[PDB]
């Protein structure tokens, strides 16, 4: 019953399995994790010497 | 009817109150704001609010 004082001191509550909607806020967001998953160059590098079309140039012959 | 002693759970955040008996030391950690100094501000306020007991 001492942890009640530690609880109101720290403002905590039972995090999993209570169905009060708070889990959907305190969950980490996967939005950064979903879009950093891929890596596609545009097939035409703006620097120079794009290989993705050099292969086309080599197989043209 | 079995559970690990180290729950080490997730899907939440907190101030993580903890004590270390090995060196007789309490440990509180930071998790809410992105920068470290904003968290230092929050835990410093929590330390002041801790001493209101």
């Amino acid at each position: 019953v001492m942890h009640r004082l530690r609880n109101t001191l720290f403002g905590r509550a039972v995090r999993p399995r209570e169905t009060t909607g708070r889990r959907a806020l305190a969950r980490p967001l996967q939005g950064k994790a979903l879009t950093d998953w891929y890596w596609m160059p545009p097939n035409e590098s703006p620097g120079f010497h794009s290989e993705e079309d050099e292969y086309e140039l080599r197989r043209a012959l | 009817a079995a559970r690990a002693a180290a729950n080490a759970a997730a899907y939440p955040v907190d101030v993580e109150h903890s004590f270390c008996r090995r060196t007789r030391t309490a440990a509180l950690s930071t998790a809410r704001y992105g920068s470290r100094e904003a968290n230092r501000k929050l835990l410093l306020e929590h330390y002041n609010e801790l001493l209101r007991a």
Binding site: R15, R17, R27 | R3, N7, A9, A10, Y11
Partner: peptide, 24 residues
């Protein structure tokens, strides 16, 4: 089921006696 539904043994076979940790 090795007593899959109602035992203190077959429920370690069905992964329930180990209560699933809260994770996501």
């Amino acid at each position: 089921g090795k007593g899959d539904n109602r035992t203190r043994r077959g429920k370690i076979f069905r992964g329930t006696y180990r209560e699933q940790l809260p994770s996501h």
